[PDB]
Design an enzyme around this catalytic site. Structure first.
Site, PDB file in Angstrom:
ATOM      1  N   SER A  62    -111.461 -23.618 -46.716  1.00  0.00           N
ATOM      2  CA  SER A  62    -111.383 -22.625 -47.799  1.00  0.00           C
ATOM      3  C   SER A  62    -112.154 -21.553 -47.487  1.00  0.00           C
ATOM      4  CB  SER A  62    -111.311 -23.392 -49.015  1.00  0.00           C
ATOM      5  OG  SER A  62    -109.995 -23.988 -49.266  1.00  0.00           O
ATOM      6  N   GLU A 115     -85.568 -12.918 -66.275  1.00  0.00           N
ATOM      7  CA  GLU A 115     -86.617 -13.504 -67.006  1.00  0.00           C
ATOM      8  C   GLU A 115     -88.033 -12.990 -66.637  1.00  0.00           C
ATOM      9  OE1 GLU A 115     -85.300 -16.564 -69.165  1.00  0.00           O
ATOM     10  OE2 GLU A 115     -87.112 -17.114 -68.357  1.00  0.00           O
TER      11      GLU A 115
HETATM   12  C1  HEM Z   1     -95.138 -23.247 -53.048  1.00  0.00           C
HETATM   13  C2  HEM Z   1     -96.000 -22.556 -53.540  1.00  0.00           C
HETATM   14  C3  HEM Z   1     -97.566 -22.312 -53.030  1.00  0.00           C
HETATM   15  C4  HEM Z   1     -98.391 -23.497 -52.610  1.00  0.00           C
HETATM   16  C5  HEM Z   1     -97.760 -25.096 -52.923  1.00  0.00           C
HETATM   17  C6  HEM Z   1     -99.611 -23.167 -52.087  1.00  0.00           C
HETATM   18  C7  HEM Z   1    -100.763 -23.851 -51.788  1.00  0.00           C
HETATM   19  C8  HEM Z   1    -101.784 -23.752 -51.500  1.00  0.00           C
HETATM   20  C9  HEM Z   1    -103.025 -24.679 -51.398  1.00  0.00           C
HETATM   21  C10 HEM Z   1    -102.993 -25.989 -51.987  1.00  0.00           C
HETATM   22  C11 HEM Z   1    -104.056 -24.097 -51.006  1.00  0.00           C
HETATM   23  C12 HEM Z   1    -105.590 -24.520 -51.215  1.00  0.00           C
HETATM   24  C13 HEM Z   1    -106.558 -23.560 -51.607  1.00  0.00           C
HETATM   25  C14 HEM Z   1    -106.697 -23.518 -53.186  1.00  0.00           C
HETATM   26  O1  HEM Z   1    -106.705 -24.470 -53.512  1.00  0.00           O
HETATM   27  O2  HEM Z   1    -106.449 -22.232 -53.448  1.00  0.00           O
HETATM   28  C15 HEM Z   1    -103.622 -22.509 -51.015  1.00  0.00           C
HETATM   29  C16 HEM Z   1    -104.578 -21.718 -50.543  1.00  0.00           C
HETATM   30  C17 HEM Z   1    -104.107 -20.306 -50.362  1.00  0.00           C
HETATM   31  N1  HEM Z   1    -102.687 -19.788 -50.458  1.00  0.00           N
HETATM   32 FE1  HEM Z   1    -101.327 -21.026 -51.184  1.00  0.00          FE
HETATM   33  N2  HEM Z   1     -99.473 -21.838 -52.121  1.00  0.00           N
HETATM   34  C18 HEM Z   1     -98.391 -21.328 -52.483  1.00  0.00           C
HETATM   35  C19 HEM Z   1     -98.240 -20.039 -52.665  1.00  0.00           C
HETATM   36  C20 HEM Z   1     -98.936 -19.175 -52.126  1.00  0.00           C
HETATM   37  C21 HEM Z   1     -98.499 -17.702 -51.829  1.00  0.00           C
HETATM   38  C22 HEM Z   1     -97.516 -16.751 -52.845  1.00  0.00           C
HETATM   39  C23 HEM Z   1     -99.796 -16.983 -51.404  1.00  0.00           C
HETATM   40  C24 HEM Z   1    -100.020 -15.639 -51.005  1.00  0.00           C
HETATM   41  C25 HEM Z   1     -99.116 -14.839 -50.499  1.00  0.00           C
HETATM   42  C26 HEM Z   1    -100.653 -18.064 -50.737  1.00  0.00           C
HETATM   43  C27 HEM Z   1    -101.565 -17.992 -50.065  1.00  0.00           C
HETATM   44  C28 HEM Z   1    -102.743 -18.469 -49.851  1.00  0.00           C
HETATM   45  C29 HEM Z   1    -103.791 -18.092 -49.203  1.00  0.00           C
HETATM   46  C30 HEM Z   1    -104.356 -17.018 -48.584  1.00  0.00           C
HETATM   47  C31 HEM Z   1    -104.779 -19.375 -49.488  1.00  0.00           C
HETATM   48  C32 HEM Z   1    -106.263 -19.315 -48.830  1.00  0.00           C
HETATM   49  C33 HEM Z   1    -107.149 -19.342 -50.256  1.00  0.00           C
HETATM   50  C34 HEM Z   1    -108.706 -19.285 -49.744  1.00  0.00           C
HETATM   51  O3  HEM Z   1    -109.118 -19.812 -48.887  1.00  0.00           O
HETATM   52  O4  HEM Z   1    -109.518 -18.616 -50.699  1.00  0.00           O
HETATM   53  N3  HEM Z   1     -99.999 -19.307 -51.340  1.00  0.00           N
HETATM   54  N4  HEM Z   1    -102.298 -22.350 -51.135  1.00  0.00           N
END
Ligand code: HEM
Ligand code: HEM
Ligand code: HEM
Lengths: 70, 58, 49, 377, 241, 75
Positions: D203, D269
């Protein structure tokens, strides 16, 4: 109907309808009401003035109503 | 109270994961009985539709 | 020279039951684990519900 | 020992136990698990709903009532689904926002997959709302689906292909059901790949600096903080479903569908309201849907316009203001989107739409450059 | 015309978080429904046993059901027959298809009453406001008899009438039924026909607030406890001289 | 990927810790705590607050003009 069910709405409405905000509102109603009557080919229809009156009246109705209702 | 309640809770019931699990489950039962009813009871500060109150009239 | 190695005071963080250099800690241990564990036990009972 | 070596445990161990994580992540990192939670909660109450729901026009609405009156605890199950959809959107919106603010998008693959995840749940939720076959379900199904008819020489055929008829009829409901069932599983596989690419770097954190120098194991630390985190999700969700079940759905969508009515209302919505505002801000069939689409696919352009020498916004004041103006502008957009297209609302809805694009495409990158210059970088 | 008025906020006994629903009122409201309201309004998503545990007693509810009739299953030939309603068949379509409403009702279609409280904003307030409050058509307004005048109702041209005209009464405990009391009760019953789960909803909610109110602090103390190794923690940098 | 023991190279940094069962989970919570939330708020208002009030104002103005427009005196 002719005379003998004490509709609480009517009672509380009196006191309500009366009051300042509605006095003024009804004034405008009458004002505008009397204009509409005073012509022929007109269209400024007095609909708005009525609601404003009612609103002012009705808020005060809600506040004082249900208290009495059983 | 005195050589501590928690101390005894630990010594007699929390040092093992067994007894720990065991108390939590026993504690789960009673809690449910106490709360489920407690919350239903507190809810009775609305002596209204109170089915019991209506049961007597009709 | 590694003998200059301190150990910052934590009085500002230690529970009361452990504040005295003069006495054991084996005593308040039970109470301390007791408390911290009671908290988690009560929680699981809660979640269980 | 056993956790580290066993083929299945490794996966769990590498993702939730020994995963080195920054000792630094704040609340804004919780939406990751929260979406994960929302995804499961939405599949679980969703399945139980499918055990009583029927996807045929003449019983569609009736089956939904059947659930709330007759099916034991059908009502909570129904409202949890309903509200979980909004809860899934608030979380989705926090998550995207978090990444934007913190430069998390520099992880292209993870991010790009994220955009695919954003689109997939939007397509999913849109189909969800049509299922009860309510006034808004039908007309929202009509209004939105008809956009595709702006595509030149292909459009008419396209809309008629997905519709199944010449309207939103029988074929459309059953159709929309099938895709609403299949979509969240696909979403899942994709979230696994989301997590797969993310694990390749670990992260990011509020400073955008780099945390190899101070990592802590995902276990006590972030399992227990995600727990407390899921608990607050439940509170928000349950507070919504028990006390105000129809709050975000608004008292409206009851009364069955009527293909001849057309309610003086028509609005998707709340989660599409910002996009909705952007679309109607443009006098033009093609342009409207072109800008509608662009308002979301623009997330795939963000990393190309990073510009700043620092990754996060923590140390950048001007950028913060601009970011906040983005969120502020997105409120205006949903607010406008939820109002008729008359006197005041048109022109600000028009202005706010230009701003949205001016902010992301021009103002934000410029501020980055200015910021670099003030630091002599 | 796109110019109108929104209902005030009446102090119902079922608004404001943990709040029952006046059940003695739902019952009077049921009476109002069966006598005056049902003549032209269907409530086809509510059956007689729904009225059981809630207002009436088992026998009571069956007796009402029994009363009038429905078209029960096929007589061993191929024509259907009639019998005293059971506890299992839903209240009683006064109009067969939709155009029958138009026919017997000026040309207008009186919408269903199963939901209505959830299908119109303000809910019971709008119905209450639509009921009790009726007015003299102001100046320049041209009714045309079919359409009556109604503040609140959008457009102001209605088709209903005020079937609350102080009466066409009923009574168990004999409530002095004016137009007010007769209106509150319908709406209260209407709330229940729209959202039966109302009470229980708010009961779980009470339990949810008490539990969250107890789990939340505990889960927090669980978390700060484990994070304390990190929050309280000290660093020193000792580079070679 | 990444593991522990293969993250990066660090030299000469000592870290003292104390067991969770020997410290309080909520030390100066209200004492040290509240001033901190005030300080964090100070640091951020001027960047968070303004954009929002700009909308807050646009919102109430936007509604007034709308409502006041569906009315009229002469002509
Ligand atoms: C089904 C919907 C989604 C799920 C289940 C999901 C899941 C996750 C999870 C579990 C993390 C772990 C890091 C944290 O806890 O923030 C994460 C980080 C991240 N997610 Fe998602 N996400 C989803 C939608 C999105 C979308 C809409 C975006 C943006 C376009 C995104 C982009 C990112 C990025 C760039 C990280 C890195 C964050 C960091 O290291 O600061 N995700 N996501
Ligand atoms: C594969 C898992 C899923 C299943 C089996 C499922 C099932 C259903 C069913 C049967 C309905 C119609 C009954 C009803 O309206 O209450 C429905 C409606 C709906 N679904 Fe899902 N669903 C799933 C996943 C999702 C996802 C991930 C979302 C996105 C948040 C979603 C959003 C919605 C919405 C907004 C409605 C209409 C709200 C309502 O009227 O209650 N569903 N779903
Ligand atoms: C039995 C005699 C009744 C008849 C013939 C009747 C007929 C109608 C008609 C024609 C309308 C449509 C008005 C329009 O579209 O302009 C209407 C609407 C309505 N009815 Fe009645 N009605 C009756 C009694 C009632 C009663 C007793 C209630 C509830 C206490 C009721 C509840 C309502 C409500 C709440 C609406 C509002 C529809 C809306 O707001 O859009 N009706 N009824």
């Amino acid at each position: 109907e002719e005379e003998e069910l004490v509709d609480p709405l009517t009672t509380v409405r009196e006191q309500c309808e009366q009051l300042e905000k509605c006095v003024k509102a009804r004034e405008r109603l009458e004002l505008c009401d009397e204009r509409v009557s005073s012509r022929s080919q007109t269209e400024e229809d007095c609909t708005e003035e009525l609601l404003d009156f009612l609103h002012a009246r009705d808020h005060c109705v809600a506040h004082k109503l249900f208290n009495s209702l059983k | 109270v005195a050589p501590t309640l928690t101390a005894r809770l630990y010594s007699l019931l929390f040092r093992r994961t067994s007894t720990f699990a065991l108390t939590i489950v026993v504690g789960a039962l009673f809690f449910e009985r106490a709360f489920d009813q407690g919350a239903d009871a507190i809810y009775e500060h609305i002596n209204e539709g109170k089915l019991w109150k209506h049961i007597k009239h009709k | 020279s590694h003998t200059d190695i301190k150990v910052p005071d934590f009085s500002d963080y230690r529970r009361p039951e452990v504040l005295d250099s003069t006495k054991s800690s084996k005593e308040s241990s039970e109470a301390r684990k007791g408390f911290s564990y009671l908290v988690t036990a009560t929680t699981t009972v809660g979640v269980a519900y | 020992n056993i956790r580290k070596s066993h083929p299945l445990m490794k996966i769990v161990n590498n993702a939730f136990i020994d995963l080195p994580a920054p000792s630094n992540i704040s609340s804004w990192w919780n939406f990751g698990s929260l979406l994960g939670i929302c995804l499961i909660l939405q599949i679980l109450t969703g399945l139980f709903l499918a055990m009583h729901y029927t996807s045929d026009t003449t019983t569609a609405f009736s089956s939904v009532t059947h659930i709330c009156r007759d099916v034991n605890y059908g009502w909570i199950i129904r409202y949890m689904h309903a509200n979980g959809a909004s809860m899934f959107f608030i979380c989705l919106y926090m998550h995207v926002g978090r990444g934007l603010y913190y430069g998390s998008y520099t992880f292209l693959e993870t991010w790009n997959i994220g955009v695919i995840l954003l689109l997939t749940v939007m397509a999913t939720a849109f189909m969800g709302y049509v299922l009860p076959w309510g006034q808004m379900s039908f007309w929202g199904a009509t209004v939105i689906t008809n956009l595709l008819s702006a595509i030149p020489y292909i459009g008419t055929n396209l809309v008629e292909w997905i519709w199944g008829g010449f309207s939103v009829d029988k074929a459309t409901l059953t159709r929309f059901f099938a895709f609403h069932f299949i979509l969240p599983f696909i979403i899942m596989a994709i979230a696994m790949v989301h997590l797969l690419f993310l694990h390749e770097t670990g992260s990011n954190n509020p400073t955008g600096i780099s945390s190899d120098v101070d990592k802590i194991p995902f276990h006590p630390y972030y399992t227990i903080k995600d727990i407390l985190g899921a608990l607050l999700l439940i509170l928000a969700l349950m507070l919504l479903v028990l006390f105000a079940p129809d709050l975000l759905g608004d008292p409206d969508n009851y009364t069955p569908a009527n293909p001849l009515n057309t309610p003086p209302h028509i609005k998707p919505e709340w989660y599409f309201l910002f996009a909705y505002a952007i679309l109607r801000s443009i006098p033009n069939k093609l342009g409207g849907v072109l800008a509608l689409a662009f308002s979301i696919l623009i997330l795939a352009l963000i990393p190309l316009l990073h510009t700043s020498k620092q990754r996060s916004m923590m140390f950048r004041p001007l950028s913060q203001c601009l970011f906040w103006a983005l969120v502020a502008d997105l409120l205006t957009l949903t607010w406008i989107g939820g109002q008729p297209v008359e006197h005041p609302y048109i022109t600000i809805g028009q202005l706010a739409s230009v701003l949205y694009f001016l902010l992301i495409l021009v103002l934000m990158p410029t501020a980055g450059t200015i910021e670099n210059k003030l630091l002599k970088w | 015309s796109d110019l109108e008025l929104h209902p005030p906020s009446y102090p119902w006994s079922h608004r404001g978080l943990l709040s029952s629903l006046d059940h003695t009122s739902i019952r009077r409201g049921f009476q109002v429904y069966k006598q005056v309201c049902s003549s032209c309004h269907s409530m086809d998503y509510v059956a007689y046993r729904h009225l059981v545990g809630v207002c009436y007693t088992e026998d009571e509810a069956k007796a009402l059901a029994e009363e009038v009739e429905v078209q029960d299953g096929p007589n061993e030939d191929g024509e259907m027959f009639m019998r005293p309603g059971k506890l299992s068949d839903y209240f009683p379509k006064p109009y067969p298809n939709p155009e029958a409403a138009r026919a017997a009702n000026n040309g207008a279609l009186p919408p269903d009453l199963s939901y209505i409280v959830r299908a119109r904003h303000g809910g019971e307030d709008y119905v209450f406001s639509l009921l009790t409050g009726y007015c003299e058509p102001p100046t320049g307004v041209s009714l045309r008899e079919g359409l009556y005048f109604n503040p609140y109702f959008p457009g102001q041209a209605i088709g209903m009438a005020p079937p609350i005209y102080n009466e066409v009464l009923e009574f168990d405990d004999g409530t002095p039924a004016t137009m007010s009391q007769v209106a509150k009760d319908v709406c209260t019953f209407l709330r229940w026909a729209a959202e039966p789960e109302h009470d229980h909803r708010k009961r779980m909610g009470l339990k949810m607030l008490l539990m969250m109110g107890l789990l939340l602090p505990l889960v927090y103390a669980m978390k700060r406890h484990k994070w304390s190794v990190l929050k309280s923690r000290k660093l020193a940098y000792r580079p070679p001289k | 990927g990444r593991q522990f023991g293969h993250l990066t190279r660090v030299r000469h940094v000592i870290t003292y810790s104390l067991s969770p069962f020997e410290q309080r989970a909520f030390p100066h919570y209200f004492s040290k705590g509240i001033p901190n939330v005030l300080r964090r708020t100070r640091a951020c208002i001027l960047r968070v607050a303004p954009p929002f009030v700009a909308f807050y104002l646009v919102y109430t103005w936007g509604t007034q003009e709308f409502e006041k427009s569906k009315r009229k005196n002469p002509a």
